[PDB]
Symmetry: C2
Subunit: 296 residues, 2 copies
Amino acid sequence: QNLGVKTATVTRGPLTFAQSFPANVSYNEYQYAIVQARAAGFIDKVYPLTVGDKVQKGTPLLDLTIPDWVEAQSEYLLLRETGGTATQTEGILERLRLAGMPEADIRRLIATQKIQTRFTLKAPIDGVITAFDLRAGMNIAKDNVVAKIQGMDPVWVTAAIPESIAWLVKDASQFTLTVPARPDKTLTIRKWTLLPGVDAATRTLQLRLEVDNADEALKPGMNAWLQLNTASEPMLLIPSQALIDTGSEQRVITVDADGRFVPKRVAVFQASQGVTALRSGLAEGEKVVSSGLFLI
Amino acid sequence: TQNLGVKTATVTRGPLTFAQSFPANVSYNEYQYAIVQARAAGFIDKVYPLTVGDKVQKGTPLLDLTIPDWVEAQSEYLLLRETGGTATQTEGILERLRLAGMPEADIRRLIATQKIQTRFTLKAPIDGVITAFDLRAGMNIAKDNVVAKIQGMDPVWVTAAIPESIAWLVKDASQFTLTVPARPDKTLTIRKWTLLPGVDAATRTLQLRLEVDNADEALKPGMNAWLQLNTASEPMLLIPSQALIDTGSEQRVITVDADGRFVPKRVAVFQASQGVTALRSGLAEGEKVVSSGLFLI
Ligand SMILES: [Ag+]
Ligand SMILES: [Ag+]
C-alpha cells in the first residue's frame, strides 16, 4: 500500500512502424532548359565551357552565322530604295521571322541598316551545363539541339517502396529525409509523388520526391536516407513499462478509482516503439500503472 | 466502329492483394514433447532395442522395473481377503497405493491372479520420437526423477520472419499459403497460427508461429519452407488490367454507357497487382468497361 507511483491510462489508437530506406538523388527533367536553332546555319566562337559548368543566367554560349537568311534580308534591303510599297517589304519580314529570325535583330537591321551579320545566343536560365562541348565550326540543321542546362532549385530523391506498404502513405510528414554527406540544418521536402510503376524485381514502386535545394548543398547520385513512418489499424494501447510477464502468463494492473488494484488478463497483439497494443484483455478507458512499485 | 465479338467488364470498389513469399524454418513444438518420470524410488529390468532417437508408435514399452516397499503393503492387504477384514478396510489401502502410484491395470491383476505383484513395465505416453534415454540394465533411481523424453511430430512448427509494418494486415489463416521444395506432394494444411510479439531488432521483424498438420509425417525440421503470403489494401475502384491501355503519358480506357456506344475516358492508375489495377481517380463505381475486346479505328 505505497503511493510513490505514476499513473497511466489505456487508450485506443494505432502504432507507428519505423523504416529507413535507400535513396539516390536526381535531377528533375523538368527544371531544365534547352536552346535550339531557329533554322540551319554555321558557327563561330564558343566560350571556355565544358559539359558542366556554372552559368550565372543569361550569358553567351556561342556566336553563329547563317547564309541563305541573308539572301532576302538584302533583297528586302533594296526595297527601301526602289520604292516598293510598304506592304511589300513587310510581307517579306514576316516571311523571315517565319523561317525564324529573332525579333530584336530585325529592328536592328531596319535601324542600323547594315545587313545582319552573325548573332550570338545566350543561355536562358541560371543552372548547370549538361551536354555541349561541340565547338568551332559546324554545320547544323533547323530546330536541332545545341545544348542543355540543369536547374537546381528543386531536386529529386527516389526511394524504392514495397507495394505491400505503399497505400499506407498519404502525407508528407511520414517522411523524414537525412543525408550522410550533409547533416546540417534541415532537409525540407517540397512535394511527394509515387510512380505506380512496379519494379518487377522486388514489388517496388519508385517514390519520387522534390526536395528544396536552395543553399545548393547537394549534387546528384549521392547517398540519401529516408525515415518513413507507417501506421496500423487502431488497437487498445498501453505504455510498455506498465506491462509484465515472463512465461505463459501475460497481463497487468487494473486500477479502479477506489485506489484498489487487481490482476486483469491481456494478450499482447504486438509491440513497437516502447509501447504495446493488446489484441484483447482490457477496456478502452481503463487505468494502469507504469513506473510503479509495491509489495506482496 | 461496330464489332461485338467481345467480353464485358464492370468497374467495382475494393482492395488489391499483395503477394509475398517468405523464408521459413521448420521446428518442433516445445509443447508436443513428453517426459516419463518415476513415481518413487525403484530398480530396473529389461530396456528394449531403443536408441536416443527412434520411432515409438504410441503407448509402447520402454522398460520394466522392480520395486520393494510397494510389496510391503500389497501383501498386508492380501491377508485381509483371508483374515476377514471388512471390505472397507482393504479398499482403504488400495487407494493408499494408487496414491503412492500403482497402475490401475495392475491392481486388477493383484486382485484377480492373486499372486502378489512382481514387477511392472512402463509404456510411452505419446506417439513420437525418443530424445534422451539410452540408460539401461540395472540401475538405482530416486522418486520423480526423469528417465526419458519424447518429441511429438503430429503438429509441427514453422516460423516466418515477418515485418511489423505489414504485421497487423494479417488476420486469417487463408492468406497463408505454405509450400515446401522437399515435398511438393498434396496439401500443406495449417492448424492454427500466431505471432510472438518479440520484434527481432535486426530488421523490424516478428516471428510467425504456424502449427502445420504433419500426419503422413513427411517433414523433419531444419528443412526449407516457403510462405506465400497475401496482404490487402484500403478499398479503391478496380478494373481488369487487360481492359486498360497506355504506353506513354496517356492513360485511360473504355467507357461503355449502355447504349452500346463507347468513349475515351481518362483515368489515373494508383498501382497494379495480381493482374488487375486500381485507379486513384478516373472512372465511376459501377461504370462499364471492356476486357478481351478488339476492334478498329
Ligand atoms: Ag490490429
Ligand atoms: Ag488507390
